[PDB]
A paper describes a structure:
The cryo-EM structure was determined at 2.24 Å resolution using an instrument operating at 200 kV. The reconstructed cryo-EM structure consisted of 24 identical polypeptides with residues from Pro2 to Leu311. The overall cryo-EM structure of StSOR was almost the same as determined by the crystal structure. The CheckMyMetal server indicated trigonal bipyramidal 5-coordination with an outlier nVECSUM of 0.26 and the distances between the iron atom and the ligands were slightly greater than those in the crystal structure. The lengths of the extensions toward the iron and Cys104 are ~4.0 Å and ~3.4 Å, respectively at a 0.0435 (4.5σ) contour level. On the other hand, chimneys were determined with lower local resolution than inside the molecule in the cryo-EM structure, and the map of the side chains are more ambiguous.
Sulfur oxygenase reductases (SORs) are present in thermophilic and mesophilic archaea and bacteria, and catalyze oxygen-dependent oxygenation and disproportionation of elemental sulfur. Here, we report the biochemical and structural characterizations of SORs from the thermoacidophilic archaeon Sulfurisphaera tokodaii (StSOR) and present high-resolution structures determined by X-ray crystallography and cryogenic electron microscopy (cryo-EM).
Residue numbers in the entry:
A (entry chain J), B (entry chain A), C (entry chain K), D (entry chain V): 2 to 311
Amino acid sequence: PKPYVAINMVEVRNDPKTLELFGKVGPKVCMVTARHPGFVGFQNHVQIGVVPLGTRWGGAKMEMSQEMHSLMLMQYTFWKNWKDHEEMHKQNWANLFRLCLQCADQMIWGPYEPLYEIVYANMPLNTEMTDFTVMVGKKFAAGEAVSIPPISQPYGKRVVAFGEHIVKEGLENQFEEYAIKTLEAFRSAPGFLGGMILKEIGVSPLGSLQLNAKGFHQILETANGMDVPEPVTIYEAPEFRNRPQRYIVHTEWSDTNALMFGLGRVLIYPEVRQIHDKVLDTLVYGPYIRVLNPMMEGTYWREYLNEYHL
Amino acid sequence: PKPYVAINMVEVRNDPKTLELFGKVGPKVCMVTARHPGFVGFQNHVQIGVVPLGTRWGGAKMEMSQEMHSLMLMQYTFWKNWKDHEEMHKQNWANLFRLCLQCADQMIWGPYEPLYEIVYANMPLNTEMTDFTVMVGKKFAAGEAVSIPPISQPYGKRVVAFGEHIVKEGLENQFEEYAIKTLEAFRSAPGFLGGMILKEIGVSPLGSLQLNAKGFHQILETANGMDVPEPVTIYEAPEFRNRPQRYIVHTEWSDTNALMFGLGRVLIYPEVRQIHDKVLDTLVYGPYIRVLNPMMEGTYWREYLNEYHL
Amino acid sequence: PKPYVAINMVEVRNDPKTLELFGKVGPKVCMVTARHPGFVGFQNHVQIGVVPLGTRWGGAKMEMSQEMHSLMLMQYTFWKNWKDHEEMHKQNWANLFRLCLQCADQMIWGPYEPLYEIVYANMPLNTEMTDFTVMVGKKFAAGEAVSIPPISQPYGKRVVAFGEHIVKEGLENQFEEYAIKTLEAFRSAPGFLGGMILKEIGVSPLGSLQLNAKGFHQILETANGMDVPEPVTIYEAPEFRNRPQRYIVHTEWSDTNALMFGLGRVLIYPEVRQIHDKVLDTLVYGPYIRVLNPMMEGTYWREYLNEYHL
Amino acid sequence: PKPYVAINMVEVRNDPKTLELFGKVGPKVCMVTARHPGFVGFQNHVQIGVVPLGTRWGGAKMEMSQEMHSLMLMQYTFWKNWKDHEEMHKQNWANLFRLCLQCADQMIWGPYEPLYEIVYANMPLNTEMTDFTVMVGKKFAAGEAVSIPPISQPYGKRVVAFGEHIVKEGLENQFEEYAIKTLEAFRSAPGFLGGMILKEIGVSPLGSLQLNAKGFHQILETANGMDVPEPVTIYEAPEFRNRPQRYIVHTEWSDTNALMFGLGRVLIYPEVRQIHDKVLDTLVYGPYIRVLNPMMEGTYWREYLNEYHL
Ligand SMILES: [Fe+3]
Ligand SMILES: [Fe+3]
Ligand SMILES: [Fe+3]
Ligand SMILES: [Fe+3]
């Protein structure tokens, strides 16, 4: 089935101390999150750049991570229902608060965790280059050679285009129809590894460290998280649902050149350009496309999505 | 059929003199070992690191071999019966003792050679990236497309997870049932190249240089092995069988990232986590996972195991 | 009386960060351990080398600690009964787990805590070079000039030979008889400071961080130990008793030269060589002798052993 | 059909001037040689090392070309009949002599051109890594999936083992039977790209610059080849046929590691070792195995050999 996505967004310092926190805190958060049975996987990203679109953002590059002082992280977690994510944060609040405060001396902005519903998904199983013989052998034996997916390599060997779209009130049905048609047109592009369309349905309060006045002061006052705040919030997740409607267009590409000319088909390929013009006529903001590197992954979330493994 | 494994374990210095002994003594030992008809192959490893499991062993890294003063070597030899290995060491004792003493000025600990029985094996044929066209062509012509194995590249192009498990008395049947189910669950992980479960059944006395009192003094007294000790031991191999039962969980991965997130499924994937919880409830020691690099290989041992070549 | 010994074995990184943990965590562990009345003292060691025995381990030296990337630590604790050690770990589990996890980012292997019974002991009171006038004055006034011990200087001013022996089933009575006679023969060697023979009787589960499946996951998931695992183990200490029988032959020497030629009397002194030949005829593994430096000590454990102080 | 091979052997200096002669003279020689219709292709090699076989030639390495002062070149030309090669050299003698004398200030030994008959051949079509989709698609459409060859990459992306064997008089039938069985056993080795067995049938006089006394003096006297010697020789090619019989065992491997452990199966794999023991019992000289790099190739000679292209 289609899972629900929580996207944890943080800005951290770009220094060697922070990349130690990728391997010493990141796995522990995933292990605490995996105590809940509704957890079906994760995909963690570091922003490496921005699609400039010619000179529209000409100060930005697709690979600019070596020059930035701060790193944007997008940590996806996938859930059977979005209430499973809110139940996970409440039941594991002491362990998760203490782990998140280990990243405190690196954190610049955040955490901010909007919740998303998957509107459309074409996301294949992640395979290494050593695994494609198993993949095409199983699909040929099942008579499904026409549905053999591309080789989507896990753990930092592909790039993600993170496309932010804010759609005018009343034009959400027109966005979703033609953004789907745009992503089906990307299937012809070389290096396209798959795509999904995410629709924001709320913001997690506990994942965003948004408590009431007593809880907010206990966050500021605690020594390394030993003094755990009482996890009382003033809102639940659908009460912070941003209007007008936010959409993420998430597409995966084998490299940044395939991303630049593949996504560029909405500008340079005239048949795809008329399709994406209907998307552009619904937007109050966007498109702004961040380039992400999926470092740490829980690739079995695509096994839940595609209802098939290996 | 399933062969028996002798695992020769030595600690040697990490210096350029030692890596000359890989190419000037290592092949000679394999050639003396191949005088016996029960010898079916070998697989030689160098430990390159330890799986840290978050911060459980936080001073350890998966790739730490450039910083270590000493190298752990695990030299597997594969045998039609474990008595063939003990017969080989007795019949070729003078040549093997002299070759092992060429590594003497580098050796820090060892040699220690426990003998193992293969409980479970899913170990495919080793193929290069130039050989997969032959592999999928032969399996399609035989109507076995569903059993096409992953590309397991020989000679240092993959990594080995060496998982040490000591199982409580009486819980060996529960370990073997659910460690098998854990290794079948690894088939879904990207970059999984195969696995086997080894059960310790004894320790070779001649392979461990364990003689009686007269033989031990002749080992210390000899000049470069020219004075060969009489190979009289005080025990045979099943008389040194460690209780409680030692198990090796040997899994092969395309790279260390595939190893870290693949083996990590027993911590972060909730369906595999319940399976491996039954493994953890049988352990008096472990799991401790070393990361090994298979440098020198006798890959035809998998032809004996899978009863098929090419 | 003869106390029981728990030997905590860890491998840590050899870096200046680790030697800060000797003085900032080590004393706190000893202070938590001293809450129990059955605690009678401690002796903490760092491995500085290996006895090479000619060229048997020729890559090893007696003083090689300046070149090693990792340090082996042997932390002895002495107990009136071995159940007092298991009762101490359960009652002080939260404080001890949190202190042990301060060493986590340095730890490579371990912790592993086998429990030992003292078979034989000739271990004198530790005296400084300023204290021998008190020692010989008290022994002359008591008419015990014939039992005046050697000056065994505490706190890093002597070396320890850590002799590992694994004895065949049924030959444990022959080992203990002639290993005692070997240690009485060491009394004639210059620089011999005393010796004891330790017999492994079990492995502490809490001291080895060996919990059940829920406890093991809480060890991996916790942030610096603030989230304390429930200390439920699947075994008690005599249920992990290694067969065949492990022995430690622990001897103390004034320097490494006295150690090398003193222990070498089992090879070069013909009267002691026939005695130790009966020890060698019982061994399935060994002898392997590590060289240890006793840095931090609780020297009053010898006051309990010898039933006399000063 | 099976072509005939002329192998031009020269020793040249290892300097940057010589590698200019690879690209400025080498192609011109191939273009003059292609004037004859019996020319079916070429394969030019540079020796990069020697198989040491443990310490049998321990001063030699498989990759030692960066340290050598001189380069051995083996330039294969393939012919429909060996008389076509002798007819080519006589008809194009002025152009070929002038091109060969452009390499004169680099040449140390040679040229020496023995002629060979192909006894056995398993030499697939050369394909790039971009061409395997065409190769497996054509073989599946023709119902020949069982005979899909390995990917043999042209132009320096594989290595050649050049195995010299001199066989006793009367044992040539025993050599050819079991050297064929050895090369069929190499089909199981990883990275084996194919093999052929060459039998020396003569030495080309014009290709070896072996003229009569007047022609030899005109070779020494000429200014850059403008003064062309009269190509009168004292012998034809079967009159210089070396006795006892020379054989080349030519095998191709994806890399030097695949070569070392693949060819090593005649020493370490006991089933192949008994086969190659019958080869060794026919040899008065050898085996001596040079490691060659096939830089410049005329890969369409395998299209003539396998009677099929693409
Ligand atoms: Fe969350
Ligand atoms: Fe062995
Ligand atoms: Fe303890
Ligand atoms: Fe020629």
